């Protein structure tokens with residue numbers, strides 16, 4: 112058995128999108144096909160289900176005006192169309208079977224709802240605010256703000272600074288992604304030695320460096 | 328809609344030791360046919376959810392006998408006799424007796440370790456960002472444990488919470504600590520209206536507020 116789900120989707124808010132789930136290894140028209148959702152870092156939500164035999168549908172009322180379920184028995188593919196998707200609809204969509212004969216889930220489809228066009232991040236230096244240095248260690252960082260789509264890759268000194276690094280997961284906020292990264296080095300290393308974060312954003316074909324200058 | 332309640336939301340475990348997760352339903356799950364529709368799924372990182380137990384205690388093909396589901400009515404339990412690395416992830420309970428089926432919030436398994444105070448650092452907006460008209464103040468609270476931390480931004484004494492973005496790392500694969508980032512973004516004008524910016528964390532490793540501040544002077 113196997114449920115093959117379609118690729119990631121970038122959807123403009125207020126428009127629409129339709130995802131597919133191709134089944135194989137069992138009789139498509141013999142069991143209900145479920146559709147679930149998992150928004151960023153949240154739990155699971157059952158959207159509804161469809162029986163490919165007659166395209167009969169049972170929807171969680173919470174999605175009645177959001178999801179339309181259909182099927183194509185010819186290619187044993189299940190479809191879910193989302194109407195007027197908003198930022199609140201961004202999430203990983205799963206089709207699945209959970210019945211007496213089996214429990215199978217597709218690999219999932221990522222749907223990001225944003226009006227943003229490809230946008231390189233604005234990289235900003237995070238330098239201590241000339242506030243004490245009684246610490247043996249010094250923490251610096253880079254704020255990678257307002258980019259789209261995800262992801263970006265951040266390194267410090269071109270991979271020379273590996274340990275002592277924390278590159279936080281990106282958060283999708285107001286149509287754009289924002290992420291930060293910290294690095295800690297001894298007081299004898301910075302600023303006597305240069306510390307630079309390198310942010311690469313594949314989608315916009317950009318790779319920029321931002322040297323962390325001591326707080327003037 | 329049936330409210331499913333799981334506890335704890337985060338379960339600290341030790342590889343080799345047993346684990347127990349709770350799932351309570353707002354209404355009885357015993358359906359009119361003598362069956363109680365409650366299943367348990369495990370979602371490993373980067374993976375799709377996978378059912379492990381169905382109808383309260385029936386184990387899915389392959390599921391190690393280390394797993395045991397039990398309960399009845401509105402109270403159910405999932406037990407692992409001895410946690411293994413492969414068991415790590417997020418466990419969900421789901422009821423199918425009341426339409427529409429609803430899932431518990433999920434219980435993530437995390438490794439146990441000793442308490443660790445966070446290392447807090449605060450950073451003022453960059454002149455580059457100020458040129459663009461914005462002002463993001465960043466605070467890093469690193470390598471602490473447990474995961475429970477209460478962070479507040481205090482501007483000249485009062486807590487302000489207008490424009491905030493928090494991000495948390497996954498439990499560190501090496502030291503089992505957690506790290507957190509908190510960014511307070513104001514417009515350049517709003518920023519220049521205050522003087523003392525403070526990142527204040529309340530954590531079990533201290534009976535006093537853990538603070539780091541900077542004055543716009």
Ligand SMILES: N#Cc1ccc([C@@H]([C@H](O)Cc2ccc(F)cc2)n2cncn2)cc1
Nearest residue numbers: 143145207209210421423424425426427428
């Ligand atoms: N009330 C009710 C109700 C409505 C629909 C169903 C569904 C299915 O189990 C729902 C489900 C999906 C994923 C999962 F992880 C757990 C459960 N279904 C039934 N037959 C085939 N699918 C079940 C109960």
